[PDB]
C-alpha cells in the first residue's frame, strides 16, 4: 500500500521525464546553423552566421541572432558500421523504445490492481522498467557516439 505509491509515482516521473526529453530540443548546445542555404538572398552567400544553438533529437534552433527561434530539422544522412549508426541515431528508436517500455511498465502497474492474484503482472512491470533503462543507456551512447563524427 505504501511501497506501491513510490512505484506508481516513480513510473510516472520516469515516463514524464523521458517524454519531455524526447520531445524538447535542449540536448546539446553547439555552434552551428539553423537556417537553410540562402542561395539567392545571399545573406551570407553560402556559409551563414554560426551562432550558439540548442539541439535535440529532431530539430536544431538558434538562441541568438537575427533568426532567433527559427528551427531547422537536423539532417543526419549527409552528402556499414557508420551507416547503421546513422540509421539508429536518425530514427531515435532507443530513446523512443524506452518511452514505450516505460509506458508498458505503468500499464502493468495499472493492471496489477484489477487482477490481484496474477503475480506475474508485477514481474512484467519490473522487467519493462529495467529494460527501459537499458534502452536509455544505448540511446545515450548512440547519441554521444554520433555527435563525434
Amino acid at each position: 500500500g505504501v511501497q506501491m505509491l513510490l512505484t506508481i509515482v516513480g513510473a510516472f516521473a520516469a515516463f514524464s521525464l523521458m517524454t519531455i526529453a524526447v520531445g524538447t530540443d535542449y540536448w546539446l548546445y553547439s555552434r552551428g546553423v539553423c537556417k537553410t542555404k540562402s542561395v539567392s538572398e545571399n545573406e551570407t552567400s553560402k556559409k551563414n552566421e554560426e551562432v550558439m544553438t540548442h539541439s535535440g533529437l529532431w530539430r536544431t534552433c538558434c538562441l541568438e541572432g537575427n533568426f532567433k527561434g527559427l528551427c531547422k530539422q537536423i539532417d543526419h544522412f549527409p552528402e556499414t558500421a557508420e551507416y547503421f549508426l546513422r540509421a539508429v541515431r536518425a530514427s531515435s528508436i532507443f530513446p523512443i523504445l524506452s518511452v514505450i517500455l516505460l509506458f508498458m511498465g505503468g500499464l502493468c502497474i495499472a493492471a496489477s490492481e484489477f487482477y490481484k492474484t496474477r503475480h506475474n503482472i508485477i514481474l512484467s512491470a519490473g522487467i519493462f522498467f529495467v529494460s527501459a533503462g537499458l534502452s536509455n543507456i544505448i540511446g545515450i551512447i548512440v547519441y554521444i557516439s554520433a555527435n563525434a563524427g
Binding site: 558500421a81 522487467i127 551512447i141 563524427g149
Partner: protein, 401 residues
C-alpha cells in the same frame, strides 16, 4: 581590357549563352574591373586573350607573347588579371601596386578524422590472439574438468570443479576477478598456475600495447614547413614544369630548398607534371602521399571546392604579388595605381577575396565514448541476454507446474 580565363578570377556565367557584352563573364577580376573603372570614371570592354598564355618571352624572335605582348604592342590599355609582377616584365610594362600578395605554398591531401570503429578496444591485440585466447580458454576449462573429476578414487563430488564451474574459474582468472573455489589438487593447481601465468602476460601486453598506441598517436606532428618535407622521404613533393615554381627551386641558394631541387631533377618517376589540373588530381589520387607546390591563391581556392580532400599547410616559401598592368607611356598608370590603393584601405580587396575564395565556396587528448562504444554495447547486450536466460528458465519451470 585584356584578360585570361582562369578560375576563380574569371569564369563563364551559369547561362552566359543568353548574355552579351561584359556580362558574359564573372569572377574576382570581373568584379575588380567594375570597382577600378567606377573609381577612375572609365568605360572598359573585357576581351579574353586569344592565345591563353600569361606572358612569356620566346627568347629567339624576341616577340612578347600573351597579355604582356597585348600591352607592349598597343592591343589593350589595362590588364586586369592575376599577372605576377616580375623584373623581366617590368622592363616592358609598368605594373600597379599588388592587389593580392601570395607565394609558393604546400598542398597535401586533407586527412580524415579517422572516426574510431565500434569494436576498436580489441585493436591492441591481433585477431589471431583473440581467437587463440578463446581456444586456450576452452582447452584450459576442459583440462581443469578432466583432472578434477575423472578419478573414481576421490568421489559426493571430490570438489566443486565441474565443467560449468571450470569455465567460471577460467573466465574469472582471465579477468583477474572472481572468488569461490580454487583447485586443491596437484594436477588442478598446475592448470591454474599456467593459466594464471598466461593471463598475467596477456593482460599486461594488452595494457602495454594500448599505451603504445595512445602515446604514438599523441606524438604525431603534422607537417607545417618545407623543411619537414625535405627531411622526409615517404611523401613526394612536386611542382610543375613550365613556370616560376620550377625556376624558384633551380635558382634557390637556400640549403633547405636546394636539396629539394636536386631530388626532383633526377627523381624517377618524373614528379614534374604539366597541367595544374593533373597535379591537383595526383595528390587526391594517392591517399595522402603526394605534395603539390603551387601558388597560395590557387591552393586556397581548390581547398574550398569539392570533394574537399585538399588543404593548405605550412607557409609561403616566397613573396610575390599580382598587379594590374598598363602599357608604357600611358596616362592611366597613376589613376589605376591610386585606384588599387583606394580599394585596399576601404577593404574592398579583402571583401572580394572572401567573396570568391570562401563565401562562394563549397567546403562549408582524453578518450572519447566512441573509443569504448563497443564494450558498452557488449555489456548491455550481455545484460539483455542474461535477462532473456533467466526468464526462459522461469517460464519453463512455471509451465511444468
Amino acid at each position: 581590357v585584356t584578360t585570361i580565363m582562369e578560375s576563380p578570377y574569371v569564369m563563364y556565367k551559369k547561362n552566359h549563352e543568353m548574355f552579351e557584352g561584359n556580362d558574359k563573364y564573372e569572377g574576382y577580376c570581373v568584379d575588380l574591373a567594375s570597382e577600378i573603372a567606377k573609381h577612375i570614371g572609365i568605360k572598359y570592354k573585357i576581351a579574353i586573350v586569344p592565345d591563353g598564355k600569361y606572358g612569356a618571352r620566346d627568347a629567339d624572335t624576341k616577340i612578347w607573347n600573351g597579355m604582356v605582348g597585348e600591352l607592349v604592342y598597343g592591343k589593350a590599355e589595362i590588364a586586369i588579371a592575376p599577372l605576377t609582377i616580375t623584373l623581366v616584365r617590368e622592363e616592358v610594362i609598368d605594373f600597379s601596386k599588388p592587389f593580392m600578395s601570395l607565394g609558393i605554398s604546400i598542398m597535401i591531401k586533407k586527412p580524415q578524422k579517422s572516426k574510431p570503429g565500434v569494436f576498436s578496444f580489441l585493436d591492441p591485440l591481433a585477431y589471431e590472439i583473440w581467437m587463440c585466447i578463446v581456444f586456450a580458454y576452452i582447452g584450459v576449462s576442459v583440462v581443469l574438468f578432466l583432472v578434477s573429476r575423472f578419478s573414481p578414487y576421490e568421489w559426493q563430488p571430490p570438489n566443486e570443479f565441474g565443467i560449468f564451474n571450470s569455465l567460471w574459474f577460467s573466465l574469472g582468472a582471465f579477468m583477474q576477478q572472481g572468488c569461490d573455489i580454487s583447485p586443491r589438487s596437484l594436477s588442478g593447481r598446475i592448470v591454474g598456475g599456467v593459466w594464471w601465468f598466461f593471463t598475467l602476460i596477456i593482460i599486461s601486453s594488452y595494457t602495454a600495447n594500448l599505451a603504445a598506441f595512445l602515446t604514438v598517436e599523441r606524438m604525431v606532428s603534422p607537417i607545417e614547413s618545407a623543411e619537414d618535407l625535405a627531411k622526409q622521404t615517404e611523401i613526394a613533393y612536386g611542382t610543375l614544369d613550365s613556370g616560376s615554381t620550377k625556376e624558384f627551386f633551380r635558382r634557390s641558394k637556400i640549403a633547405v630548398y636546394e636539396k629539394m631541387w636536386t631530388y626532383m631533377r633526377s627523381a624517377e618517376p618524373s614528379v614534374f607534371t604539366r597541367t595544374t589540373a593533373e597535379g591537383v588530381a595526383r595528390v587526391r589520387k594517392s591517399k595522402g602521399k603526394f605534395a603539390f607546390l603551387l601558388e597560395s591563391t590557387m591552393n586556397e581556392y581548390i581547398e574550398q571546392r569539392k570533394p574537399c580532400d585538399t588543404m593548405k599547410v605550412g607557409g609561403n616559401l616566397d613573396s610575390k604579388g599580382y598587379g594590374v598592368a598598363t602599357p608604357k607611356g600611358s596616362s592611366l598608370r597613376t589613376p589605376v595605381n591610386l585606384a588599387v590603393l583606394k580599394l585596399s584601405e576601404a577593404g574592398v580587396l579583402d571583401k572580394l577575396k572572401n567573396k570568391w575564395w570562401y563565401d562562394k565556396g563549397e567546403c562549408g587528448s582524453a578518450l572519447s565514448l566512441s573509443n569504448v562504444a563497443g564494450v558498452f554495447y557488449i555489456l548491455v547486450g550481455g545484460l539483455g541476454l542474461a535477462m532473456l536466460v533467466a526468464l526462459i528458465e522461469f517460464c519453463y519451470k512455471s509451465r511444468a507446474e
